[PDB]
Structure formats: C-alpha cells, structure tokens
Amino acid sequence: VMKXXXXXXXXXXXXXXXXXXXXXXXXXXXXXXXXXXXXXXXXXXX
Amino acid sequence: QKRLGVDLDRWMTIQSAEQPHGIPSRCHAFEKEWIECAHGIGSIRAEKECKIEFEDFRECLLRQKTMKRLHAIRRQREKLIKEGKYTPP
Amino acid sequence: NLMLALLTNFTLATLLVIIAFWLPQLFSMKFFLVAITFLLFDLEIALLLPLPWASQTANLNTMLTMALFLIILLAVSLAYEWTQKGLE
Amino acid sequence: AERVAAFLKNVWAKEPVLVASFAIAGLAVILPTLSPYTKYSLMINXXXXXXXXXXXXXXXXXXXXXXXXXXXXXXXXXXX
Amino acid sequence: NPIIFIIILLTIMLGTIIVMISSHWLLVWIGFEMNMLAIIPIMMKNHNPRATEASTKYFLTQSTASMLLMMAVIINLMFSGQWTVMKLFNPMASMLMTMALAMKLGMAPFHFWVPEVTQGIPLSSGLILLTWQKLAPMSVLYQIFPSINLNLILTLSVLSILIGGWGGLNQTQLRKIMAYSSIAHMGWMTAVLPYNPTMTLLNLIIYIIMTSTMFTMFMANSTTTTLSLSHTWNKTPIMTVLILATLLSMGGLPPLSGFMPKWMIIQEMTKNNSIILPTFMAITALLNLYFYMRLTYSTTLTMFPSTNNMKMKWQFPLMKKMTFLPTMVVLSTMMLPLTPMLSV
Amino acid sequence: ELPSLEDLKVQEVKVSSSVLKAAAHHYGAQCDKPNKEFMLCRWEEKDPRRCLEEGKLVNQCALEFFRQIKRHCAEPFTEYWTCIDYSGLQLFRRCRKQQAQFDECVLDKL
Amino acid sequence: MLYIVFILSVIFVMGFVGFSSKPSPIYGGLGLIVSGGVGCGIVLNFGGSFLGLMVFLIYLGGMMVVFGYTTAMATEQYPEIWLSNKAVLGAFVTGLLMEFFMVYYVLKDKEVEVVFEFNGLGDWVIYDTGDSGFFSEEAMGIAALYSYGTWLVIVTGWSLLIGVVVIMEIT
Amino acid sequence: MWFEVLPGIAVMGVCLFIPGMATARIHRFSNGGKEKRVAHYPYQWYLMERDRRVSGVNRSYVSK
Amino acid sequence: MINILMLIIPILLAVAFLTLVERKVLGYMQLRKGPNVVGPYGLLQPIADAIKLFIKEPLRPATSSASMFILAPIMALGLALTMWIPLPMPYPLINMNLGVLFMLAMSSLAVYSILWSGWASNSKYALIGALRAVAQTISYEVTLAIILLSVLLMSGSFTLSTLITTQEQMWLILPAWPLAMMWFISTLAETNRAPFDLGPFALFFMAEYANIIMMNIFTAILFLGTSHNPHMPELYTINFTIKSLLLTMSFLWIRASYPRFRYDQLMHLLWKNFLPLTLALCMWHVSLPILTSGIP
Amino acid sequence: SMVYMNIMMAFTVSLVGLLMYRSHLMSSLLCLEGMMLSLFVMAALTILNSHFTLASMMPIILLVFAACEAALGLSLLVMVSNTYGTDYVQNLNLL
C-alpha cells in the first residue's frame, strides 16, 4: 500500500485500548506452506 | 422473561460467565465493556450510548472489517505481479 | 493424514469389486418398536457419554446425583416396557 | 415376616437376574452417602491444577509465601 | 387410560412452564418440542383414520416451525452471540423468528392446517389443547416485543382477520367455526405487541376462558350445526341460554365481556396516531360475529330437529370449569375494567 | 496500533529442546521471581505491548539456570534427557531409576 | 489443496441437492451417508473430536438406520431411476446451478451475495484462532458437563421418558 | 494331532504378527530415535511446533 | 507411508487363513480331521478358495438395482479395514484424539452392509429375512455402548493408549467381573452364527470374519495387556498374539458347541435379561470412582 | 463469511426440499433429518470458533431433540401405512 488510501494505522478496532489476538486470523499472508502447518492441530496431528 | 426465577439459579446463558474450569471466551474482553455499558435501562430502549462499544464487539465475532482490509492487501499483492514485487521470507 | 488412511482402504475395497464383476467371462409392524427403543436409548447413552471425561474436574456431589438419575430413567422407561411388550 | 421372607425366595426361583437389577443398583445409591471416604476424592480433585497459577499482589497478608518449599498455602499432602 | 394420560397432560403443563420461566434461547426451544411429543398421543386416542391424518398434518407443519425458529437462534450467535431472550439484534433473524411463531399460532399465511387439525381431534378434551397451546408462542412474543419489524407482523395480523372472517362463512362443522375464530382472534393478539406489549396477556385471558367455556358446553356430543340443533327440545332448554351468552360474547358486543379485548386493543392503538388500522379491525370483526349470528338461530329458534328418540336419563359429563368460567365470560366489563393493571 | 520496534526481542533464545526444558522442573524452584514478575504483569495488564521488558529478564534468568547444568553434572543430566525422549508420551514413567542418578549429583551444589 | 473446509463444504451442499430433488427415498437416504459423513469433517477441522463423532454415533449410527426400516415398511422393493423421472432431474439441475455458478464468483476471494456478508480469502483466517489454551483445551476438551447445567439434564430426561411411553400408545 | 492344528496357528503367528512389528520398526526410518509424538491436547502440539522452530527446520523430532 | 499397506494385505491373509482354523479347530471338536489333501497340512486352501470364488465363479443377477449390490461390499470391506487404524498395537497408525468413539461409530456404521444387501434383492422374502438380521445387530450395540462406558469409567479416557497404562500389573477382567462375561456375549452381534444366523458371496464374509478378529483384539486390549515395555516392542507383540488367538479359539468354541437361541428368545435375552443387569452395573460403576478416589 | 455461504445455502436448499413434493411422504421426514444436520453444523462452527466451552453441550442437547421429532413423527408415518396401503400425500380424507 503506497498509492491507495489506507494508512495501515489505528487498526480496524475503534477502541484502540484493548487489542486482542489480532494475528490469529492474519499470521502473515506470505508463504502458504507455513500457514497450513500452523493451523493443523486437528488435521494430521503429529 | 414472562415469569422471573426468584430464589433459584438456572441461568448460565450469557458469554464470558462462570468458566467450566478456567477456559476464557474469544470475545471475553469486549463483553467486559458491553455488559458494563448496558447494565442499566438507559442504552436498552435507545441503544445509542453504547454504539461505540457495540461496533468493536460485532468486529470480534464476525471479523468483517479485518476481512475487507486483508482482501485489499491481497489484491494489491496480486497487482505487484510482473512489477516491483519483493518477498522477504 | 487421516484422509490418506481412509481413501487407501476404500479404493482397494472397490478394486476387489472390479475383480469380482469384470474378470469373470462366460409387513410386520411389531419389529418397528425395536428401532424405536434403540434410537431413544442411543440419546440417553449420548448424554451418558462424558462420564469418564467430565468427572476428572467437576464436583462429585453435584454429578453423582445427576449421573445416576439418567440411568434411573433409562430403567424406568424399561419398567414401562415390561407391562405388555410383545411376542417377539 | 409377611413379604420379607415370602417375596424374596420366590424372586430367587422366578427370574433371579431381577434380584441383581435392584440390589447392585440399590447399593450404588445408598453406599456413597454412608461411607466416610468420599471426602478424600473431592480434596485431590480441586487440588489438581489444569490451568496456570496466578500470583496475587500482597499488602499485609497471611498464609502466602514464595514458590519455594515453605509452610504456606493449601498444598494437599493426603497420604503422601 | 390410567395415570399415563395425566402424566402426558402434566408434561404439556410443565412444557409451557419451561417457556414461561426462561432466559436461555435453547431452553424455550426444548419447551416447544416438549409439547410436540406430548400433544400427538391425545391427537390419536380413539384409533381413527382422521386422527392419523390430522396428527401427521399437525406434526409436519409444526416440526418445520421449530426448525425455522432454531435458525433465528443460530443467527443470534452469528451476530452479537448473546444467548439471552430480549432482542434478535438482526433485521434478518427477526423475519425468521416472527414467521416461525406464526406457524405454531393461527396467523394469516400458515393457517391451512388449523381447520383440518381441529376436525381430526376425537374428543372435546383434546380441543382445549390447541387453544391453551397458543399461550406458548405468545409468551415468547411478549419477551421479544422490540427489534421486530412492523411490515411483517401487522400485515399478518390484518390478513388473518380478513381470511378468518371469510373462512367460516362456507362452514357448518362446529370444530371448523372454532378453528377459524382462532385465526380471527390471533389478528387481535399480535396487533397490540408493537403498541405497548401489555393487554396481549389479557387478550389471552379473555380468549382462553371463552374458548374453554364452549367445548365444556359441547360435552353434550355435537360436531355440526344440525347435530347441535337437536338440543332445544329433546335436550335441556336452559343449556341453550348459557351457550347464547358465549356465542354472542365471542363477537364484538359491549354488554358481554368479550368486548373487553376490543375495548383496549383499539384504545391503545388510537393513542399512537393510528386510526386507519383500528377501523379495519372492527369492520372485519363483524364477519367474525356473523358466524355466531347464524349459530344463535340453532338455539333461539325451533328449527324442527325433534327426533323420535327421547332421552329420559339425565346427562352426566365432566363439567369441571363449565360453571365457574361462563359467569366470568358473560359479565366482567362492569366488574373489572381496572384488571389491565392486575394482569400486566 | 503502534507495535514494538524490530530490536525489542531478546537475543539468545530457544536453544534448549522442547522436552529438555520439561525434563527439569527445578526451574520452578530456582529462578522463580522473574517468572512471577512477568506473570503478575500479564494479569494486571493483558497486552503484551507493555510487559516485554519483564520478559527480557525472564530470558536472561533462564540462560543463567541452564549454564549451571552445562558446567556441572552434564553427564547424569544428558542420560536423563536421553531417557525422557526414548519413552512415548509417559514422560515420567520408566525413568525413575535414572531420576535417582539425577538430583544426587545436584545435591553437591545448592 | 490449500483449502481444507471450503472443498468439503461444496460436497456438503451437493448432498442436499439430492434432497431438493426427489430421487426416491432410497437414493435420498444415500444423501445422509454422503453429506453426514462429510458433515463430520467440517466440524472436525475447527477442532472438537467429540462433537464431530456425535454425527457418526447418532445420525450415522442410529437415525438413518431407523429410517432404513421405515423405507422397507412403506414405499419399498424398488426405487425408480431419477433419470427417467420428470421434474426431479429439473430440480436437480437448477439446484446445482445455484451453487456451482456461485463458486466461480467466490474465485478472486471476495464475492457479492444476497446477504451483506462477503466470501473473503478463507485460507489464513480459515482457523480464526492462534494458540488460545494448552492442556484439556480447544473449547471441546471439557465439552459436556453435568455440573452447572443441572436443569438441562432433568428436562432431557423428561422428554426421553415421554418418547418411550407415547409411541407405545400410538402403535 | 497337534502337528496339523498348530501350523494353522503358526501361520497366524506371522501374518497377524506383522502389524505389530511393521508399526514399530518404521520409526527407525522416520526418526533418529525410534519415536513419534501424538498431540492429544494443544500443549503437546505447541512443544512439537517449537521443536520444528529449533535447529531442524523441516524435521519435527530432533535433539537439542 | 507403507504401514497402511502393511495393515491390509497381511490382514486379509489372516481372514483367509481363518477359514482353515475354523475348519480345523471345529473339526477336532467334532472328531473329524481338518484339510490335508490340499497341501502339507491343508495350508494351500485359502489361496485355492480365492482362485475358485473370484475368477471363474460368475454372478447370476436376481435384479441388480443399478447403484446397490455393488455399493454394499464397499460398506462391508471398507469399514471393516478402517477399524484397524486406531488400534494400539505398540504405536498405532495416526493415534486418534478419542480412540473408542471411532471404534464404536464405525462398528455401528457397519450395520448398513447387511441393510443395503437387503435392498439389493427384489424379493420380499429376502428383505424381511434381512431386517430380522439387522434387528440382532441393532440391539446388541446398545449393550456394546453401555459396557464400554462402564469399563472406561473405572480407568482411562477415550484414548486407546491409556488403556494399556491402567493394566500395568492387574487385568480389567477382575474389577469388571460380571462385565467380562457380558462383553463376550455382546461381541456376538455382527452375524456371528453362534447366537443366530440369517457383490459375490466370497468377499461379503471376508468382512464378517475380519470383524471377528477385530473384536478379538478389542477384547485383548480392554481386558488383557499384562505390560507395555517401551524398551522392547517385540516382547509385547509375541505376548499379544497368544492372548488374542486364545480368544479367537473361544469364538470357534461357542459356534461349535451351542445351538441357535430362537430369534424371539434372543430378543428376550436383551431388554429382559441383559439390560437390567448392565444398567445396574452402569449405576455401580458410576459410584466406584466416587466411593474410592480414582478418576484419572 | 467463507464457510457460512455454503451451510446457510444448504439450509435454504433443504427448506425448499421440505415444502416441494412428489407424493412421497418418506422424503419429507428424511429432509427433516437434513434440516437438523444443517442446524448442527451451523451451531458447531459458531461455538467452536469463538471458544465458548459452556455452549459446546448445547448442540449435543439439540442432537437429542433432533431425534425426538425424527422418530415420533416417523411412528405416525407407520400408522398411515397401517390404515392405507402405501404412504402418499395425495391419499387424504380431511376437508
């Protein structure tokens, strides 16, 4: 984001005091092989 | 309730209540605002005083505001194809 | 993977069916009550499922009064069944 | 006896499996209240910590010390 | 049937208690389905082809009603996620809540089962268990009186009196007339719910008592107008006077206490700048009166149903609340007009 | 949102294996105060953004405990560690005999 | 390949296509085996092994088994082929075109719908949870309890007493 | 006699004996320690997650 | 992943070699001799039956109802082989979060195998005869669920790996003494021929004989075990094979010795005789970990 | 958002499947099982994602009352096949 409108600040929440897990749903979009291994507690189970 | 339950307990209905052992709710902190905001009848009939604390609480369960934001990043990441793209990991 | 374990069993089972077929070249309403009793008892067993699973942490004085109570009504249902059940 | 001696030996002769259905299930209800042994099982059940321990900030408080071995808190030592 | 008939009857009484004394959304869900398992054996009773057809038509409409209601419960987890019966918090879940409760009641679009279910009931004891059953969906509607849209409740209340007022004109079956007065009265029930939730509970009190007085006086076996005709001369003439007090009260007549709902439903609505709707209520209510107009002529006139066979032995039915309740059903408009406060 | 800087995370961490840490619960007795300071910080202030300097003291004290085992009684500790990994998921059963060899060496020290 | 839940959810609706269509109760009975068994996997992917296996024990180990009896009691012997049946295939073809045509719009993440909610990515936010707990956790480690919910145990027991008594009075 | 019956048991002492040995001997090839760990509860899975984070990036079970 | 293939092919050989042991043990129980003309001691007959029944033996269709008749062997053979997966043979193939829940469910899903085969034939006499055989399988799964829930309530969770740890010095036969007799009868449920009897014929009972070995190993874990020993997996497996096969002989014993119960009286064994006994024990097994401390 | 676009769609498809008929009354009760199955999955996802722990018992109770209707209504279906030959929607007497 450099040419758009998003500042990438303040976050989605309007409270800006609590701040939950946040990167539970995010956990970096890049490299899908690492994301699939991270969310596989029930699946495979090794 | 049409008939109230006086001198007897059979609730355990609302979220962020008495835990089975000690297990927390996913939106525990947000209802600590919401129940404390709307314990009186002031924002129950009007529902305007606790609008700020409700929008963040609706954001906790659905995550729609983050969903639109992450889609905007992913689309712009796809826009960088055959352009000035870089991947640190 | 669990899907890798499942599919390999089913594909070899269907493979035996291919060998089985391609390779060779040349009323009574009384039995319904059984299915009724079975399905109604399943749910009482389903409610009695978490017994060696929830007793580890929860209070015993509160549980024991309720745990036996489900088995009591599971036998009380059978006590009503004894008075004229059937010839089968 | 009118039915204590009469309607017991008849139950042994005519379907004695029904004797087991009332006696064993009967002992399952009466014995837990009578026995002075149920108190020990409740003690260890509450003592077993599944969740992580929480430290409280003390300002003039008794029966609380450091994490090291000291004469403080509950800490059940029922039969080693 | 011995004790088991009373136990089944007590579980409908207990079933509505779970609906009444509640806070959890799945708790009322159980309360509705506790009734579903318990009405069906009384629906059957006398081993009839009509009873089998009525119960299957009753179940398949009301089982779908509960599953539509459970959808509204699950959307209440999709948004907000609070399991307390107070508000729906959704413009979508409120639609699937009101329409599901309309299925269990005799409201406009889901009314088709009501006359054919009432016909298949073997006895007068089972006929009460539909008028008393309507207390259960009404109790939930009182709890969720806000957050529910006017455009899909008031339209269902207006249409129900229209279809109720034309739905008994081409009918002679005594069960069918009572089934369409049920559809007619439900329009007067839900019309109050936005304009103060009070008086809806009192509208139940008047309706449930007045309907129970009918079937307890129908203990002398009658299924049609022509079968209730042979009652003036062959049977007791004082019984025709007391049914006259219940026939005329069901329609809008001020000397009788069946005008006591039509007193306050119009009064509370006119307070909130709405006049065009209460006009439409009262005019269509005359069509509801018109069924009883032709049904009063079965008792007031001779009508020639003599029959050669004459009864000498006096009739001995149950008649449990057949004496205490019609005295309150005939006159209470002069007795307690302040009862609005006492009930709600 | 404003998160912490890139050079906020403490150096020298996660050098020990998963079961190597689980082998010794003496870490609960010795070096317990800095662990309890971070624990009390978390229940008072739920955010990880404020309680990170206390966590730097946790990572520093953890290395001080393990280096003592690296210097003295390395032989009975590694033998106990090879025993604890050889078993399935029992993690304490079938290793009590080599647990007797442990603690006895450590008894010479404090 | 990358998706886990979304691929199984399509097969879940595909089973229900055979319910909107009426291909005789025998072939419709096969729907509860396909959509039910896959329906376990949708529950199992988010966690909670106990609740996912409840469909295996009751729906697949009782419910449809008893429904297998009534198919033999009434409307039995032979099921008519759905290819020969009129409008049954018409309901089947219109049923799939409400789902398969939609999936093409779900491609490129976001999609327009009748409801306000959008599709999204469904790969990184598919689990929607980080670490949360540790021992006896995952929300359904201690799932069902007789403690606290003592009232719910009684009322379930009442309805199951009703069921045995009532069906005996019907038949 | 039992020179006929027991060979019918001895052949079962091979084929039914295979699944017990095959599941045990396979951990020699999969792991350098003859062990595979099962999660059961999220705590033991996180230990396996950080074991892949330490030293061996691809391998789950590794020393130090 | 070669282990799955090492739990299908040698497993099907154990089903194939079962037909010899069923003919030889029952043979010696009847003073006749087992197979001898075929091989050295008749050991070459299980492969000889496989060539006979599959290759040249055809199928004359009664009706062949399109989807069925070919679908029923998939529910038979497929579900019987999936049961082998969570079994705690030293270290199981992908150990389940809950062991016995997968064990009870796939056995209750195996009821369809005899149900779909009843639909496979057009004749009414076949399906009425089929539903009667379903009625036996459907009823004894209630007792199968109860006895399991009372054995686990003594010690261990639903995990099959914890059932080995509880039997460190003492078997579960002695604390569950009436249940040991009860579980042995309830295992005779999936058309075992000992209590009562009702694609091609060959592969259909290849799943039915597989379920007999399945229950034989399931008895050898829930009631037997002796020890575990993580140091040597060999010492457990040799000891397990003797314990499992001694129970396999006992299923060939009940079939040999005892006649059919009369279908009605077999249904009188349940509800009237078995269910009042098992529920009273279920009541008793609730109180035991509360009376004396023992809730693992 | 992602999964809820299919399981809600499966509910609406089954909602059509109930009220649409081709004379078979067995198929309607079969769809009532599917309706409860679709309600089971939709409830499971809402409770499992947002870690409630207490509400996990509720779909188990819902599963019990799913089978309560889909047996007692199924018993009435048998009574239709006792009075009449074969179960059909067209075969009725009520007016």
PDB file of N, CA and C in Angstrom, chain B residues 2, chain E residues 20 142 197-206 260 336-344:
ATOM      1  N   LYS B   2     -41.290 -13.904  30.942  1.00  0.00           N
ATOM      2  CA  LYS B   2     -42.696 -13.697  31.308  1.00  0.00           C
ATOM      3  C   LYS B   2     -42.929 -13.937  32.802  1.00  0.00           C
TER       4      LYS B   2
ATOM      5  N   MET E  20     -42.265 -20.213  29.846  1.00  0.00           N
ATOM      6  CA  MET E  20     -42.571 -19.062  30.706  1.00  0.00           C
ATOM      7  C   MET E  20     -41.377 -18.642  31.568  1.00  0.00           C
ATOM      8  N   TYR E 142     -44.058 -11.800  23.707  1.00  0.00           N
ATOM      9  CA  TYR E 142     -44.072 -10.789  24.766  1.00  0.00           C
ATOM     10  C   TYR E 142     -42.657 -10.435  25.240  1.00  0.00           C
ATOM     11  N   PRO E 197     -46.726  -3.732  24.699  1.00  0.00           N
ATOM     12  CA  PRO E 197     -46.812  -5.203  24.798  1.00  0.00           C
ATOM     13  C   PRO E 197     -47.872  -5.702  25.787  1.00  0.00           C
ATOM     14  N   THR E 198     -48.296  -4.819  26.692  1.00  0.00           N
ATOM     15  CA  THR E 198     -49.398  -5.069  27.628  1.00  0.00           C
ATOM     16  C   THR E 198     -50.732  -5.239  26.890  1.00  0.00           C
ATOM     17  N   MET E 199     -51.702  -5.844  27.583  1.00  0.00           N
ATOM     18  CA  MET E 199     -53.049  -6.188  27.060  1.00  0.00           C
ATOM     19  C   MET E 199     -53.091  -7.414  26.138  1.00  0.00           C
ATOM     20  N   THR E 200     -51.927  -7.820  25.627  1.00  0.00           N
ATOM     21  CA  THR E 200     -51.768  -9.061  24.860  1.00  0.00           C
ATOM     22  C   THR E 200     -51.941 -10.271  25.788  1.00  0.00           C
ATOM     23  N   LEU E 201     -51.439 -10.138  27.017  1.00  0.00           N
ATOM     24  CA  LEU E 201     -51.597 -11.149  28.066  1.00  0.00           C
ATOM     25  C   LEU E 201     -53.042 -11.241  28.561  1.00  0.00           C
ATOM     26  N   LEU E 202     -53.729 -10.097  28.616  1.00  0.00           N
ATOM     27  CA  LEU E 202     -55.146 -10.044  28.998  1.00  0.00           C
ATOM     28  C   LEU E 202     -56.059 -10.550  27.880  1.00  0.00           C
ATOM     29  N   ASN E 203     -55.655 -10.309  26.628  1.00  0.00           N
ATOM     30  CA  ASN E 203     -56.353 -10.832  25.447  1.00  0.00           C
ATOM     31  C   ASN E 203     -56.349 -12.362  25.431  1.00  0.00           C
ATOM     32  N   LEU E 204     -55.275 -12.959  25.955  1.00  0.00           N
ATOM     33  CA  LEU E 204     -55.193 -14.405  26.184  1.00  0.00           C
ATOM     34  C   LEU E 204     -56.200 -14.867  27.235  1.00  0.00           C
ATOM     35  N   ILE E 205     -56.242 -14.164  28.371  1.00  0.00           N
ATOM     36  CA  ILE E 205     -57.138 -14.484  29.499  1.00  0.00           C
ATOM     37  C   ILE E 205     -58.609 -14.541  29.057  1.00  0.00           C
ATOM     38  N   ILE E 206     -59.042 -13.529  28.302  1.00  0.00           N
ATOM     39  CA  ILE E 206     -60.405 -13.472  27.752  1.00  0.00           C
ATOM     40  C   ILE E 206     -60.645 -14.601  26.736  1.00  0.00           C
ATOM     41  N   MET E 260     -64.277  -6.632  25.987  1.00  0.00           N
ATOM     42  CA  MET E 260     -63.141  -6.178  26.806  1.00  0.00           C
ATOM     43  C   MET E 260     -61.750  -6.238  26.140  1.00  0.00           C
ATOM     44  N   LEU E 336     -64.575  -5.773  36.375  1.00  0.00           N
ATOM     45  CA  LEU E 336     -63.157  -5.409  36.383  1.00  0.00           C
ATOM     46  C   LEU E 336     -62.677  -4.777  35.061  1.00  0.00           C
ATOM     47  N   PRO E 337     -62.875  -3.446  34.903  1.00  0.00           N
ATOM     48  CA  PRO E 337     -62.211  -2.709  33.821  1.00  0.00           C
ATOM     49  C   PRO E 337     -60.815  -2.220  34.222  1.00  0.00           C
ATOM     50  N   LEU E 338     -60.483  -2.369  35.506  1.00  0.00           N
ATOM     51  CA  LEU E 338     -59.182  -1.989  36.059  1.00  0.00           C
ATOM     52  C   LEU E 338     -58.205  -3.174  36.109  1.00  0.00           C
ATOM     53  N   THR E 339     -58.680  -4.338  35.658  1.00  0.00           N
ATOM     54  CA  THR E 339     -57.882  -5.572  35.567  1.00  0.00           C
ATOM     55  C   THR E 339     -56.675  -5.546  34.598  1.00  0.00           C
ATOM     56  N   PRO E 340     -56.682  -4.652  33.566  1.00  0.00           N
ATOM     57  CA  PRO E 340     -55.469  -4.284  32.821  1.00  0.00           C
ATOM     58  C   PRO E 340     -54.185  -4.093  33.641  1.00  0.00           C
ATOM     59  N   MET E 341     -54.301  -3.473  34.815  1.00  0.00           N
ATOM     60  CA  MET E 341     -53.167  -3.270  35.717  1.00  0.00           C
ATOM     61  C   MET E 341     -52.797  -4.542  36.486  1.00  0.00           C
ATOM     62  N   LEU E 342     -53.814  -5.305  36.890  1.00  0.00           N
ATOM     63  CA  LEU E 342     -53.641  -6.534  37.674  1.00  0.00           C
ATOM     64  C   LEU E 342     -52.971  -7.669  36.897  1.00  0.00           C
ATOM     65  N   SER E 343     -53.293  -7.774  35.606  1.00  0.00           N
ATOM     66  CA  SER E 343     -52.728  -8.799  34.724  1.00  0.00           C
ATOM     67  C   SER E 343     -51.332  -8.430  34.219  1.00  0.00           C
ATOM     68  N   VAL E 344     -51.176  -7.182  33.774  1.00  0.00           N
ATOM     69  CA  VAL E 344     -49.907  -6.674  33.251  1.00  0.00           C
ATOM     70  C   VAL E 344     -49.695  -5.212  33.637  1.00  0.00           C
TER      71      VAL E 344
END
